[PDB]
Design a protein around this nucleic acid. Sequence first.
DNA 1: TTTCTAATGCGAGCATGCTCGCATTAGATTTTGTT
Lengths: 911, 802
Amino acid sequence: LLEPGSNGVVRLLGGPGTGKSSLLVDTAVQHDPESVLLLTGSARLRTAARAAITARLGVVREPLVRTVHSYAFAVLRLAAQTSAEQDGIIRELLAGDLEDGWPEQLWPALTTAGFATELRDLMARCTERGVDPIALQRLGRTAKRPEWLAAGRFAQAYEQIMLAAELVGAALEALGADDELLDTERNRIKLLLVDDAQHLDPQAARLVRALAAGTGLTVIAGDPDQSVFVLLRDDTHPAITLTQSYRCAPEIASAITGLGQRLTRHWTGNPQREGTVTVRLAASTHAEGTMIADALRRAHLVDGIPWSQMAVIVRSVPGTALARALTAAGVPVQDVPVGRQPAAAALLTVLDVTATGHLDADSAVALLTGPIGRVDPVTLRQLRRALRRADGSQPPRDFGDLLVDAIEREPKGLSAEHARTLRRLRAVLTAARRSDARYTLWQAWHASGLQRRWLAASERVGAQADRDLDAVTTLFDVADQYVNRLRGLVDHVTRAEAVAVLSVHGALAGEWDFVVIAGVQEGLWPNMIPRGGVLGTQHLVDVLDGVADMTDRTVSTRAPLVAEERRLLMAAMGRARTRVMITAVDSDTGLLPSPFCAEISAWATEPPLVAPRVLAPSALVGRLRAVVCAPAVDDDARACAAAQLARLAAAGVPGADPSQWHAMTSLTTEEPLWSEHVVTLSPSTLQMLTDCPLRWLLERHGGDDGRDVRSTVGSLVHALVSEPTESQLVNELEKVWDDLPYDAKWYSDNELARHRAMLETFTRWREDTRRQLTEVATEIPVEGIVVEPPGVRVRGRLDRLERDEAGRLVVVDLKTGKSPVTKDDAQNHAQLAMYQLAVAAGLLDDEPGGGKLVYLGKATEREQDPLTPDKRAEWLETVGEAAAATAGPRFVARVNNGCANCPVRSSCPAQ
Amino acid sequence: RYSPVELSAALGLFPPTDEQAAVIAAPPGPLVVIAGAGAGKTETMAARVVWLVANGFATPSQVLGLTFTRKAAGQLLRRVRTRLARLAGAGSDESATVSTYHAFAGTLLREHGLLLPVEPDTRLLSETELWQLAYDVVCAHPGHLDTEKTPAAVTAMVLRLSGALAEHLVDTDQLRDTHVELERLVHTQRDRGPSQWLLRMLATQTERTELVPLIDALHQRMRAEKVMDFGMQMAAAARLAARFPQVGEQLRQRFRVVLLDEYQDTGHAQRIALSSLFGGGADDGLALTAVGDPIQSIYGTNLPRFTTDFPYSDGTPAPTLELRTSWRNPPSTLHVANAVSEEALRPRPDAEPGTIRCALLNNVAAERDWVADHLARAYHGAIGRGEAAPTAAVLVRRNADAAPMAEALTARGVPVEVAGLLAVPEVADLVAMLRLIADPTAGSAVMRILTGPRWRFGARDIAALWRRAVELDDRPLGTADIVAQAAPDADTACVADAICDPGDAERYSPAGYERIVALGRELTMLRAHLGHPLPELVAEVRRVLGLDAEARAARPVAAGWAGTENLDRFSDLVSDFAGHAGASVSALLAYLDAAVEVENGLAPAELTVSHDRVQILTVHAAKGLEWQVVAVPHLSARVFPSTTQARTWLTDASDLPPLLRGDRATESEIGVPVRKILSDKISDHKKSLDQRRVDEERRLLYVAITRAEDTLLLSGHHWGATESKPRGPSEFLCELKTILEEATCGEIEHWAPDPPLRDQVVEALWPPVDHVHRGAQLVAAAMAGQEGWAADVDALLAERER
DNA sequence: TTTCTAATGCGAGCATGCTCGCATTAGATTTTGTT
Ligand SMILES: Nc1ncnc2c1ncn2[C@@H]1O[C@H](COP(=O)(O)OP(=O)(O)NP(=O)(O)O)[C@@H](O)[C@H]1O
Ligand code: SF4
Ligand SMILES: [Mg+2]
């Protein structure tokens, strides 16, 4: 059997790992250069098969090695003597069908893509299992399920409008058309190496039989047990069986065959390849990832087995939480459109603006932060300032406008370094204009020097250059496609050695040495996910496929069948040739192991570990230096860890020596601000310095998020009030209000109305209290020494001063808030006390008076009793104490009522 | 078939008591089993399941278990799995299915959505991917909005109200006629016209009817994006189950026994989603047992109505079986857990009683000291005993006022005190560094970095830095001048300019200039990364900082190698938010800040430890944990009764009126008879609506008491911090005093008589001033001249050589 | 630089007893839920 001049048909089968895939190669080599056909199952398999055969063979001719779908396409080619467009057709067909007045229970569902996708699935499954639409309508009449017959008539309507998964269905009748075309190929091909028969469709199975009526020889190969994806490998045809693994270890083969016992199920591993199976667990979702990283790193670095010979065959990548945690420990892992990619988008915007001929400001900034001419934020903050020195304006010009004018013509005021960061943009935006007669895109690409930079970035970020070049090459390919198919282009484009994590289904072509089957969770691997829907596709597919179930919709729409699920794991372990590892988790607080973990633990070689060891420097040093600084445990291992840290820091590995340790860093100065003196205290400053000097420092100096909008509106109202008649103020506020950043358009109007009412309240109060108080001055500055031996010399600005009716001086200050302060805290107000102190010491022109503290919002006021020398001395003492507190290092950080909004809160030690 | 007792003794467990006998022997039919607190739930569950599967009424694949919370569902699943597996030994392939309610509703939608116009592949929103969207639709809404409220504070009302429409199934179309009935009545002593207060209540109703368009805009915005929240999801499931009977027929065919575990904590959205499917009038062959406790309803009245909602399908109600014998101390269960009788339990294990102690102190500090002393002496007596380890814990009402308990216990005890993911100092530095990289005008981040442990600066250096930063500004009044300032463009003074152009090296301290230069080089290195994808940029920043090593370098040797779980969960969240409608290195920080504002940071890794630690957890949380002696410290006038934060339906514009609340548990404000008549009638309805708030605190207090595994140290303070008035002991304590003093079983301690209070302040000098130093000296001496560390180090160096 | 809502104790307004605006001050309750 299986020899030159042998019989027309022969059957080949054997357990996984056996030489079946490479067995068929030899009989092809010895045998015309043509007349041999190899049907593998996937074009990725074609690469390996053709490579093997050709490299085992100057005038040698490539044997025709192809796939079932490709062969059906070639059959249709001789008979001539995509999913996106498919979905478009189907959705428009349903939209049309919605016109006239399906069982009507689902009329609302027709507009939805959810129904279109399920209908796509139903038709695809029907075509793959080879049932005509008329036959399915007959099924819908026989079994009283209206949706089925409706879908059958829909399929009938679908096939009307035509005359990629129907190639086999077409070829099945294409062969029968001539009935002599069959003999043309039966006399042409003699060998027909059809292979991997467990993965063939029932329709494609018919084509194989048709091509194997009788001539020459044919071979069918494949394990008739890992059929999960239903084969019929039962006949009187001659059969060859293989029972030596050649890949898996007898320890591994033991476990796999023990699994297969509860399901030719017998086969033994290669004796030479000694290996093992290990079952492990973890105590959390992260412990599993880090221990997989641990095991992979140890296997790579102690056991010598490299990357590209390991893998993590998980159930199905929905999964993604594993590549990250597995890369963090330093394990390479293998594997979003051109519109999203930023390097492509930048040059795309250049092309867009070149085609348009006009550059909006809001699109010139967007290519200063791109990769064409790149500017970081604190260089945009240099461009802004430098440009606003070119043309000093009383209100500064908008940055977008300044930038676009600078680009189109260069102002050379500062231009120190910013000459080049604008020169690149000049070059690109001009050379793009240079042609104006595609080729222009290449010209723009060349004008900017980013190609040379990226190709000189082949070092270390070097990955980013590779990604960017991939994106730009894809863009160029799209451009070529459009040229062979520029305002029409911009909207045209709008629409190795590494551990390889991959799902089980795609992991059926692996020759790996170390398989780690992550995620054997209970709700995941034996799937309890219901298979049902609205069209009953799952219940129809098994009644259609044989008599897997009678015309009852009972067992199908419950869950995937375990017998159909254990085969997956059984075939998954078969890929590992040396070692396996089945990893599941079980944690008390949300997770359990599957019913398969316990069974696998029977044939395995050997308190789930809660924080597993890792092999990575940033982990190992953080473990070592964690024991040496221990209060008391590991008395001698402390010395061992000290020696190991010495060896580590002798070479590198940042974090080892106490120079790098954070808790060993030392303060820079430890020296007073003004050890020498006179220190100036604006009245507002004293009101924070009497509460939290740390807050004074860390906020008044640099720690403030910066200029909210309730702060500039308040000062704007202050300025409107200051100038010396309500009716004329409102029209000053109205004209300027529009250039204020508010989040909500409807909010802007409400705030404008409220602030107009605020001005009106101000004028009402003013004309009310002119009956006893007269305004000496408004917005009068305050400046002059008050207490001094350190002196303070308060300086600041006063909102409004007033002369009392009977020889005094009442100082006020307008606040634009809604929440007044209490009447006892407004008796001890630091600001007003400071103003009265400044008045009492002259420098305004003269006696202490009250402090009104008028709130414009809602007009309530909280007065302060005019000072006395009995109290004034205490206030001077307080001011002196505050001034002394400004000086020394180690500022106190007191807590107070205002400690709930201070911007420096993430750094104070009192918290 | 086997009887319950015979079946139980066939296994390795004790014979179930009489209470656990009736429910197990109950015939298949809709029944409810009121299970007391501590009465041994989630074991009777497995007993009933194994009874059914052994007598052969249903195979394991036909069982279904529903439970409100994920952890309790996991517990039930584990218990059921082990019981079923053990039964296989004494007289297989499939297993139970256990799911939390919302997961079951999700599965129901994904299996039968299209019968409704509901997409199957609808993303689900967290509480911070929603707010960041409901604040967009409110911002963009065109109109008037005569409301006088800040945006992002009407977003709160829109979310709260739209979170109740999708719970009582109202759909915003019938919530437009609710104010005419009251306005017409109010508009038609003294003849002043309607009182000022009355118009305020009407204003709220008009405001709600003005929000209605905002509520409707949000729903369409979510439909357009194929996006759905938890409330909308469960409401959709309820609508589907109510409208279509074939889904119920399918589900009753597939599942022959259903386990509604926590049925007293489920609202009107699920009460109808779960009766319509199975229990309405369906076959009596289905088991349908439900074990609720009506007294302990923290979260939020379906139990009093289960009968006549899940009947025998002939028009006859369902049975009711009880569970007592709470496996709890007599003193707590007897005379104390009867604090709330209001029903219009027994000492189970006949075990030794326990002391119960009350106390009225004269200061929050004093009461804190008293409770701390009691717990401390209890803990230390274990050490002399030989490690008894009482592992107590304190139940506190407010989420605050529990941090200082760590201060008062770390002196003698060792507490855990079970901070969001964005308050752990391992992550906050990463967020701050990201912020400083992305946008310079962030002083609250520049300080967190300049004064951080990695390189401390002095006041002199910060002042000099800010001096250079303000000198570099060089910017010279009018209203157009003011408004032109503070635009999205206009520039100001920001420290992140000095760090990049420090200037002359003389001004800074000689040590502090090198640090400035190094930070400048670091930031100029990183700011080149903003073009990179965001999940890679974050890890690059973490690598550049020392966070990965240092988060481990500060950890007890007890814990094995942990420390980086918070960082890895944060990078997971980053890797999830990213690749999702936009890279957005600067719209990530908007997400992080919005998450800080609402939902209080995020969910940390929740590390577990197994020491003899005193937990400081909150009473509202941790239901079902019954471990050791517990104490409730604060029972003063306004802390525990908490009846101040009450906003009824007539003032809060984001609360459903009783007339429309499909619960109708409260009174419906008849108002049919007719202003002084009405003005009095409202206040009575408000007072009735207030007693519900009190009735929601007995259940908190009853839950707290019924966790007293060993003894109690409940107490009540006086003269709380930072106030003016005594705030004497509230309700729940005076009555608790009386109920204590008429029995064997309480002790009264110090009972401070009710009387100027504290004004002492807290301080901490800024730049702070040892085991670390001695270890550093040891390492230095080692440089000068087990666990297998040598091989690991050799392997790492062999990697380095290459 | 900045605040929601409400409970409190007046304090004139008029059929000594309420009674109702009017101005002044205290606190900002807790989590459960998908793949
Ligand atoms: N007799 C043999 N002697 C040496 N090496 C062999 C022999 N037979 C097969 N191999 C090797 O085994 C490798 C695996 O190829 P092969 O076993 O033919 O794939 P396969 O096992 O059929 N795929 P599968 O379906 O999983 O069995 C080949 O690449 C050969 O190197
Ligand atoms: S939170 Fe309090 S202690 Fe900290 S800086 Fe602010 S005011 Fe000072
Ligand atoms: Mg002012």
